[PDB]
Amino acid sequence: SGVNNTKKWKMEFDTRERWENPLMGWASTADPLSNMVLTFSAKEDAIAFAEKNGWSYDVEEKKVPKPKSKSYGANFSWNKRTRVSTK
């Protein structure tokens, strides 16, 4: 339920091929940018950083949970379906 990891903008690269190492079975790669993650304070900072480095980018809008109406008293309604059968 913690939300502390949904507060900063992140830049990550497109995932590339990983393959099995014949000796040990380890996951091998040829992608030098496979672990690169950059943190940004604003969407506009991240866009600016990608553009000067010549990287094509896709930007997705931040999703905030919608405000909700919580009423503990609704659990005991006279005539509504919100009445809970158990506690």
Binding site: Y72, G73, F76, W78, N79, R83, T86, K87
Partner: protein, 430 residues
């Protein structure tokens, strides 16, 4: 006046306390019940609530809230929902048996009290929730209710007052927590007796989600007499803000354990000696008293000498009036084992809903069991004190608080007795 006690039989309300007169309607009428009820009803809600406010009556279920203020939360225009009065007859606090006598010997006082109180709140019916173990009392109460229906005193056109009122009896199935006012409402609604959080308050959202007042049997039963004889008469007993008469249960180590009606603010010493026949073996044999039932902390013999039995006086003694159930322990008693068995009760009675009481009370119970043997070290006494303070004030309902206070009463007044057992246990093994 500054001296209280020596109540006269003319001023007693529960005149058939001991079941020596007929408990049916014929006897109840002779004793003055159901007299001028139609007159009281037609004087209206505001007048009735005025009498209860003037009398200074306070809750008899344990918490002692001013009754007239509480009952006035229902004095509001309806919103299309029915209005209800619940009468708490669960009576499950160890040491308390006062409500049991009202229902079996003065059932028509309670039924009339339901109507007068139900009218003042504007309620359509009364649900009396009685503990399941009180089967014979529940059947006495239904016989009285049937008699009142046949005589026109309740039901359609109650007492000829053009006001409709029903009185249903619902029985519990064995749970002390169902005496908590919102756990009782849930149990009526067919659920586990788990208390609700507040808000909402029952006067807003109660049983079936409707405006409700939960009132104690003793609170409800004395209301018709307060209206007939007036709030000034009732306010003439006990200290200010602690007025009226009260039913006391004296049990434990007394010569004559009994139930008796006495004026409020009566000295605790006078109550035990006059009515209960004194402490088993003399006043000097007294060790400690639990003055309000299990939930109230014990006090030692030194405090008991001068303490008055009313709400404010026992608050200054670091305990409380509670249900006015006096439990007496003489010096032959194992004080630690006595309080440990009370923690064992609360552990068996926790509804389990909320973390501090579900886990904490069970934790306190285990530590107390080790304190009885002395299988602990004195550093744990302060640990148990802190654990009880973590439960208190942090739970949904007052059961958690009522479990913490007995521990604190023991630690406050009998720390040397605990540390002495730990010393004996350590040397008995080392």
């Amino acid at each position: 006046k500054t001296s209280f006690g020596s109540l006269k039989d003319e001023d007693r309300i529960f005149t058939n306390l001991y079941g020596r007169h007929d408990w049916r309607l014929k006897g109840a009428l002779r004793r003055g019940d159901w007299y001028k009820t139609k007159e009281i009803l037609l004087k209206g809600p505001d007048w009735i609530l005025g009498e209860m406010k003037t009398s200074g009556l306070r809750g008899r279920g344990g918490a002692g809230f001013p009754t007239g203020l509480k009952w006035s939360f229902m004095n509001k225009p309806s919103d299309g929902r029915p209005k209800y009065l619940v009468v708490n007859a669960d009576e499950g606090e160890p040491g308390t048996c006062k409500d049991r006598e009202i229902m079996r010997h003065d059932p028509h006082k309670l039924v009339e009290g339901c109507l007068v109180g139900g009218r003042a709140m504007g309620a359509r019916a009364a649900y009396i929730y009685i503990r399941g173990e009180f089967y014979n009392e529940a059947s006495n109460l239904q016989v009285a209710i049937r008699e009142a229906y046949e005589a026109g005193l309740i039901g359609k056109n109650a007492c000829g007052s053009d006001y409709d009122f029903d009185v249903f009896v619902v029985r519990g199935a064995g749970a002390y927590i169902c005496g908590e006012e919102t756990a009782l409402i849930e149990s009526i609604e067919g659920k586990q007796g788990k208390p609700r959080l507040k808000p909402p308050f029952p006067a807003d959202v109660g049983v079936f989600g409707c405006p409700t007042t939960v009132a104690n049997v003793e609170t409800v039963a004395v209301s018709p007499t307060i209206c007939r004889r007036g709030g000034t008469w009732f306010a003439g007993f006990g200290r200010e803000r602690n007025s009226g008469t009260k039913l006391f249960n004296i049990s434990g180590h007394v010569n004559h354990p009994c139930t008796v009606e006495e004026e409020m603010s009566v000295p605790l010493k006078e109550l035990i000696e006059k009515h209960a026949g004194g402490v088993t073996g003399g006043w000097d044999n007294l060790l400690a008293v639990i003055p309000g039932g299990s939930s109230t902390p014990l006090i030692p013999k030194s405090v008991c000498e001068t303490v008055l039995m009313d709400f404010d006086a026992l608050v200054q003694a670091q305990t409380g009036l509670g249900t006015a159930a006096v439990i007496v322990m003489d010096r032959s008693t194992d004080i630690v084992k006595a309080i440990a068995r009370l923690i064992e009760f609360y552990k068996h009675e926790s509804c389990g809903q909320c973390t501090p009481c579900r886990e904490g009370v069970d934790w306190m119970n285990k530590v107390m069991a080790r304190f009885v043997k002395g299988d602990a070290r004195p550093a744990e006494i302060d640990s148990l004190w802190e654990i009880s303070k973590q439960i208190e004030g942090h739970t949904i309902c007052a059961l958690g608080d009522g479990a913490a206070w007995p521990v604190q009463g023991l630690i406050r007044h009998f720390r040397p007795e605990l540390e002495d057992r730990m010393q004996r246990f350590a040397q008995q093994h080392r």
